[PDB]
Amino acid sequence: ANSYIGTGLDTSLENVKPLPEACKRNVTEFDLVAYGKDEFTLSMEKRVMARMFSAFDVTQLGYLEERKIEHMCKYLGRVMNEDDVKQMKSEINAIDGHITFEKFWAWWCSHPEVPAKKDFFSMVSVDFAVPYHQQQLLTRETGELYTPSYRVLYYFRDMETGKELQVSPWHDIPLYVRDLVRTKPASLPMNRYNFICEIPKWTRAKFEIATGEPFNPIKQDIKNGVPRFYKHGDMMWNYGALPQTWESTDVVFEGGYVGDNDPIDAIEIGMTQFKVGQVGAVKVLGILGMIDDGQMDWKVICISHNDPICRFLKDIHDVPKFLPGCLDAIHEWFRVYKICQGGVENKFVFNGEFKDKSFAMKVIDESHYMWGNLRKINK
Amino acid sequence: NSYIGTGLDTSLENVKPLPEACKRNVTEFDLVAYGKDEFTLSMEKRVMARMFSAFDVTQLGYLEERKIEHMCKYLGRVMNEDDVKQMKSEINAIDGHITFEKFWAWWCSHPEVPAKKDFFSMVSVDFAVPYHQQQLLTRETGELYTPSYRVLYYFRDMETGKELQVSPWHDIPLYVRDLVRTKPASLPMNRYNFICEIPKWTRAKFEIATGEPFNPIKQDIKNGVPRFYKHGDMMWNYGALPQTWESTDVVFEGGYVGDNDPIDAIEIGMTQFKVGQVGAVKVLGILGMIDDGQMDWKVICISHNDPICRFLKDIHDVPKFLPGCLDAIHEWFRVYKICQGGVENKFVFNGEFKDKSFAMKVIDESHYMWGNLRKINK
Amino acid sequence: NSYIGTGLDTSLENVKPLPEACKRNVTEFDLVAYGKDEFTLSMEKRVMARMFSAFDVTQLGYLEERKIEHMCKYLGRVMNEDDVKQMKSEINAIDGHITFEKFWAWWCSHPEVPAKKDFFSMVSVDFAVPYHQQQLLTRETGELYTPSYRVLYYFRDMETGKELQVSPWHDIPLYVRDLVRTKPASLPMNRYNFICEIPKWTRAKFEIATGEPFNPIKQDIKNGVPRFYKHGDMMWNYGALPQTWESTDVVFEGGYVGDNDPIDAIEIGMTQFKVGQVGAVKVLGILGMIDDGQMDWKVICISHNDPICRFLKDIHDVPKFLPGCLDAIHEWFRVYKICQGGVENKFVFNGEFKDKSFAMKVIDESHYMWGNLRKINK
Amino acid sequence: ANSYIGTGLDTSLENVKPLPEACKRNVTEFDLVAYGKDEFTLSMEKRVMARMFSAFDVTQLGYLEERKIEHMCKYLGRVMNEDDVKQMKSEINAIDGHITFEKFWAWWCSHPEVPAKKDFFSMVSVDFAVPYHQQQLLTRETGELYTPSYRVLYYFRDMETGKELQVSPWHDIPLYVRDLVRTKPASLPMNRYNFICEIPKWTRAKFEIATGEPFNPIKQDIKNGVPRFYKHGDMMWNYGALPQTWESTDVVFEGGYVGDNDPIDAIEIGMTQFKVGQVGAVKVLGILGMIDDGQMDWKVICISHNDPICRFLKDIHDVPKFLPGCLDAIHEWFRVYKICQGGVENKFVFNGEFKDKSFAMKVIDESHYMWGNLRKINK
Ligand SMILES: CCCCn1cc[n+](CC(O)(P(=O)(O)O)P(=O)(O)O)c1
Ligand SMILES: CCCCn1cc[n+](CC(O)(P(=O)(O)O)P(=O)(O)O)c1
Ligand SMILES: CCCCn1cc[n+](CC(O)(P(=O)(O)O)P(=O)(O)O)c1
Ligand SMILES: CCCCn1cc[n+](CC(O)(P(=O)(O)O)P(=O)(O)O)c1
Ligand SMILES: [Mg+2]
Ligand SMILES: [Mg+2]
Ligand SMILES: [Mg+2]
Ligand SMILES: [Mg+2]
DSSP character string of A86-145: HHHHHHS--TTSEE-HHHHHHHHTT------S-----------------EEEEEEEES-T
- Residue A293, number of CB atoms within 10 A of its CB: 9
In whole angstroms, what is the distance from residue A55 CA to residue A72 CA?
10
In whole angstroms, what is the distance from residue B143 CA to residue B224 CA?
13
Single out the residue of A207, A290, A287, A251 nearest to residue A374, CA to CA.
Answer: A251
Look up residue A379 and give its amino acid: K
In whole angstroms, what is the distance from residue D144 CA to residue D336 CA?
32
> What sign does the CA torsion over C260, C265, C266, C271 have?
negative
Cβ neighbours of residue D369 closer than 8 Å, sequence gap 6 or more: none
By Cβ distance, the residue of A121, A128, A227 closest to B211 is: A121
Q: How many CB pairs under 8 A join B and D?
A: 58
H helix or E strand, kind and range, residue B195: strand B192-198
Residue B314 near residue B326 (C-beta atoms within 8 A) = no
Q: Where in chain C is the domain with CATH 1.10.238.10?
A: 19-118
- A353 Cα to the center of ligand 1, angstroms: 24
In whole angstroms, what is the distance from residue C298 CA to residue A253 CA?
48
Single out the residue of C255, C369, C368, C353 nearest to residue C297, CA to CA.
Answer: C353
In whole angstroms, what is the distance from residue D193 CA to residue D204 CA?
25
In whole angstroms, what is the distance from residue B146 CA to residue B149 CA?
6
Single out the residue of C207, C218, C335 nearest to residue C260, CA to CA.
Answer: C207
In whole angstroms, what is the distance from residue D153 CA to residue D171 CA?
13
D223 touches chain C (CB under 8 A): yes
Query: How far is the CA of C329 from the CAs of A291, C237, C322, in angstroms?
Result: 32, 11, 12
Cα-Cα end-to-end distance for chain A: 64
Residue C256 near residue C290 (C-beta atoms within 8 A) = yes
Angle at A205 between CA A202 and CA A211, to 5 degrees: 120
Look up residue A96 and give its amino acid: D
Whether B203 is in the pocket of ligand 2, judged by its Cβ within 6 Å, is no
Single out the residue of A50, C295, A135, A90 nearest to residue B177, CA to CA.
Answer: A135
In whole angstroms, what is the distance from residue B278 CA to residue B169 CA?
11
CATH architecture for segment(s) B19-115 = Orthogonal Bundle (1.10)
Question: Which letter does DSSP use for residue C332 in this model?
Answer: H
A337 touches chain C (CB under 8 A): no
Residue D180 near residue C173 (C-beta atoms within 8 A) = yes
Cα-Cα end-to-end distance for chain D: 64
- Residue B58, number of CB atoms within 10 A of its CB: 6
In whole angstroms, what is the distance from residue D21 CA to residue D23 CA?
6
CA dihedral B264, B268, B269, B273 (to 10 degrees): 40
Looking at domain A135-178+188-377, which of 1.10.10.10, 3.90.950.10, 1.20.1730.10, 3.90.80.10 is its CATH number? 3.90.80.10
Residue C222 near residue C303 (C-beta atoms within 8 A) = no
D200 touches chain B (CB under 8 A): yes
In whole angstroms, what is the distance from residue A316 CA to residue A285 CA?
5
A323 touches chain C (CB under 8 A): yes
For residue B38, count CB atoms less than 10 angstroms from its CB and return exposed for 0-12, middle for 13-18, buried for 19 or more: exposed
Query: How far is the CA of C322 from the CAs of A269, B349, D29, in angstroms?
Result: 14, 39, 37
Question: In 3-state terms, what secondary structure has residue B92?
Answer: coil
Give the position, in ligand 2's atom list, of the atom nearest the Cα of B340: 2
> What is the resolution in angstroms?
3.0
Residue A58 near residue A86 (C-beta atoms within 8 A) = no
- D342 Cα to the center of ligand 2, angstroms: 25
* Residue having the nearest C-alpha atom to atom 7 of ligand 1: A228
Pick the ligand that lies closest to the CA of residue C261: 3
Q: What are phi and psi of A29, to 5 degrees?
A: -80, -10
- Residue C332, number of CB atoms within 10 A of its CB: 21
In whole angstroms, what is the distance from residue B366 CA to residue B299 CA?
12
In whole angstroms, what is the distance from residue D327 CA to residue D236 CA?
12
In whole angstroms, what is the distance from residue B301 CA to residue B268 CA?
6
Residue from B27, B38, B107, B146 to probe the interface with A (highest A Cβ count within 10 Å):
B146
Burial code (b: 16+ CB inside 10 Å, e: under 16) for A55-68 equals bbbeeeeebbeeee
B38–chain D nearest CA distance, Å = 12
In whole angstroms, what is the distance from residue D374 CA to residue D379 CA?
8
In whole angstroms, what is the distance from residue C111 CA to residue C98 CA?
19
The CATH topology of domain C134-176+187-376 is: Inorganic Pyrophosphatase (3.90.80)
Question: Which letter does DSSP use for residue C63 in this model?
Answer: E
By Cβ distance, the residue of D27, D340, D345 closest to A344 is: D27
Number of residues in chain D:
379
Question: Which letter does DSSP use for residue C345 in this model?
Answer: P
Q: What are phi and psi of D334, to 5 degrees?
A: -65, -30
Residue B90 near residue B109 (C-beta atoms within 8 A) = yes
How far, in whole angstroms, is CA A199 from its chain's centroid?
28
How far, in whole angstroms, is CA D206 from its chain's centroid?
34
Method: X-ray
Burial code (b: 16+ CB inside 10 Å, e: under 16) for B339-349 equals beeeebbebbe
Pick the ligand that lies closest to the CA of residue C227: 3
How far, in whole angstroms, is CA C51 from its chain's centroid?
42
Q: What is the DSSP string of A79-99?
A: ---HHHHHHHHHHS--TTSEE
Question: In 3-state terms, what secondary structure has residue B274?
Answer: coil
- D292 Cα to the center of ligand 4, angstroms: 9
CATH architecture for segment(s) A20-108 = Orthogonal Bundle (1.10)
Q: What is the DSSP string of A184-207?
A: S-SSSPP--EEEEEEE-TTB-B-E
C320 touches chain B (CB under 8 A): no
> What sign does the CA torsion over D351, D354, D359, D365 have?
positive
Pick the ligand that lies closest to the CA of residue C333: 3
* Residue having the nearest C-alpha atom to atom 9 of ligand 4: D338
In whole angstroms, what is the distance from residue C248 CA to residue C294 CA?
8
Q: Where in chain C is the domain with CATH 3.90.80.10?
A: 134-176+187-376
B317–chain D nearest CA distance, Å = 14
Which residues of D118-206 form beta strands (DSSP E)? Answer: 135-142, 151-158, 164-167, 181-182, 193-199
Residue D137 near residue D154 (C-beta atoms within 8 A) = yes
Whether A222 is in the pocket of ligand 1, judged by its Cβ within 6 Å, is no
Question: Which letter does DSSP use for residue C358 in this model?
Answer: H
Residue B229 near residue B260 (C-beta atoms within 8 A) = no
Cβ neighbours of residue B12 closer than 8 Å, sequence gap 6 or more: none
Give bridge partners of residue C294 from the DSSP assignment: C257, C291
H helix or E strand, kind and range, residue B214: none
Angle at A214 between CA A208 and CA A215, to 5 degrees: 70
Crossing angle (nearest 10°) for helices A68-75 and A82-91: 120
Look up residue C314 and give its amino acid: D
In whole angstroms, what is the distance from residue B239 CA to residue B277 CA?
9
Query: How far is the CA of C297 from the CAs of B369, C333, C348, C357, in angstroms?
Result: 63, 11, 10, 14
Provide the phi-psi class of B360: left if phi over 0, else alpha when psi is between -120 and 50, else beta. alpha
Q: What is the DSSP string of B215-246?
A: --EEE-EETTEE-B-SS--BSSEEEE-SS--B
Q: Where in chain B is the domain with CATH 3.90.80.10?
A: 134-176+188-376
Question: Which letter does DSSP use for residue B272 in this model?
Answer: P
C27–chain B nearest CA distance, Å = 9
In whole angstroms, what is the distance from residue A349 CA to residue A377 CA?
30
D331 touches chain B (CB under 8 A): no
Angle at D231 between CA D228 and CA D237, to 5 degrees: 90
3-state helix, strand, coil in chain B (%, to 5): 30, 25, 50
- A101 Cα to the center of ligand 6, angstroms: 29
Which residues of chain D form beta strands (DSSP E)? Answer: 64-65, 98-99, 135-142, 151-158, 164-167, 181-182, 193-199, 207-209, 218-220, 222-223, 226-227, 238-241, 252-253, 257-258, 265-268, 279-292, 295-304, 347-348
Residue A1 near residue A13 (C-beta atoms within 8 A) = no
Alpha helices in chain B (DSSP H): 19-22, 28-34, 41-55, 67-74, 81-91, 100-107, 168-171, 318-321, 325-335, 356-376
B-chain residues near C24 (CB < 8 A):
341, 343
H helix or E strand, kind and range, residue B165: strand B163-166
The CATH topology of domain C19-118 is: Recoverin; domain 1 (1.10.238)
Q: Where in chain A is the domain with CATH 1.10.238.10?
A: 20-108
The Cβ-side half-sphere exposure at A341, using a 13 Å CA radius, reads 13
Give me the residues of C, 132-151, that contact D with CB < 8 A: 133-137, 142-149
Which residues of D40-150 form beta strands (DSSP E)? Answer: 64-65, 98-99, 135-142
As separate numbers, helices (DSSP H) first and strands (DSSP E) second, chain D gives: 9, 18
Residue C185 near residue C172 (C-beta atoms within 8 A) = no
Query: How far is the CA of B315 from the CAs of B130, B266, C10, C66, D12, in angstroms?
Result: 38, 13, 39, 54, 70
How far, in whole angstroms, is CA D378 from its chain's centroid?
34
Looking at domain B134-176+188-376, which of 3.60.20.10, 3.40.50.450, 3.90.80.10, 3.40.50.1980 is its CATH number? 3.90.80.10
Number of residues in chain C:
378
Question: In 3-state terms, what secondary structure has residue D325?
Answer: coil
In whole angstroms, what is the distance from residue D216 CA to residue D262 CA?
12
Whether B291 is in the pocket of ligand 2, judged by its Cβ within 6 Å, is yes
Look up residue D109 and give its amino acid: C
Give the position, in ligand 1's atom list, of the atom nearest the Cα of A230: 19
Whether C291 is in the pocket of ligand 3, judged by its Cβ within 6 Å, is yes
Residue C297 near residue C287 (C-beta atoms within 8 A) = yes
Cβ neighbours of residue D148 closer than 8 Å, sequence gap 6 or more: C7, C74, C75, C76, D219, D220, D222, D225
D33 touches chain C (CB under 8 A): yes
B42 touches chain A (CB under 8 A): no
Q: How many CB pairs under 8 A join A and C?
A: 58
D351–chain C nearest CA distance, Å = 31
Question: In 3-state terms, what secondary structure has residue D321?
Answer: helix
- Furthest-apart CA atoms within chain C: distance in Å: 105
Single out the residue of D197, D220, D273 nearest to residue B328, CA to CA.
Answer: D273
